[PDB]
Amino acid sequence: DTKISSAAILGLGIAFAGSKNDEVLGLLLPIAASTDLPIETAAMASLALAHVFVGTCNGDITTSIMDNFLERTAIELKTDWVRFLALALGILYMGQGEQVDDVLETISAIEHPMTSAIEVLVGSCAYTGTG
């Protein structure tokens, strides 16, 4: 039903309201980058983080979320966390931004799996003209 860990995060998700503190952002990021521990748990943490910054914006969060995008271990054979991970990347730039063009440009630089699919997704959600 609900893992003891999942429940703990739940209540914590409610308190995450103050997450708008360079303190929580400094702790979540490192844990969101998943330097080793399964990315599964990181996905949950990164989720709540957004629920908070869902109003504000920051390039830092993307930093941690980016490092993980490349750190994607064979564990990528899944099909669910990516849909959410990519969704959070689009919400951070809901108001569009030339940056989006810069980020994607980086992905194209480095050869990656069918990930190209996502590149086209976030690539569509931007300037209503795209050059």
Side-chain angles (χ1 to χ4, degrees):
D1 290 49
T2 79
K3 312 194 299 84
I4 46 171
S5 48
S6 66
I9 295 274
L10 207 182
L12 218 81
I14 297 171
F16 254 44
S19 297
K20 291 188 179 77
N21 286 226
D22 63 305
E23 203 177 329
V24 153
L25 194 87
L27 302 168
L28 266 290
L29 261 48
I31 300 170
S34 171
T35 51
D36 53 277
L37 42 137
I39 57 184
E40 196 78 58
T41 49
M44 315 305 183
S46 304
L47 208 178
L49 213 182
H51 182 270
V52 182
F53 276 69
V54 60
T56 52
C57 53
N58 190 342
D60 308 21
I61 353 180
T62 313
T63 317
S64 282
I65 264 165
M66 200 77 197
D67 305 331
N68 182 32
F69 243 116
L70 303 163
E71 204 73 358
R72 288 183 299 173
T73 49
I75 247 72
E76 46 155 305
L77 80 185
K78 278 272 181 184
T79 307
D80 181 359
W81 93 118
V82 58
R83 212 178 84 153
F84 274 104
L85 201 87
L87 194 87
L89 208 88
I91 291 170
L92 255 69
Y93 302 74
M94 193 174 185
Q96 314 92 253
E98 200 78 68
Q99 293 193 287
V100 177
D101 189 337
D102 178 11
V103 181
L104 268 62
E105 184 280 326
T106 311
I107 309 178
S108 184
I110 301 163
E111 200 295 298
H112 261 30
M114 61 191 206
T115 314
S116 306
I118 314 182
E119 180 171 88
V120 180
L121 206 180
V122 181
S124 61
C125 188
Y127 276 105
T128 177
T130 66

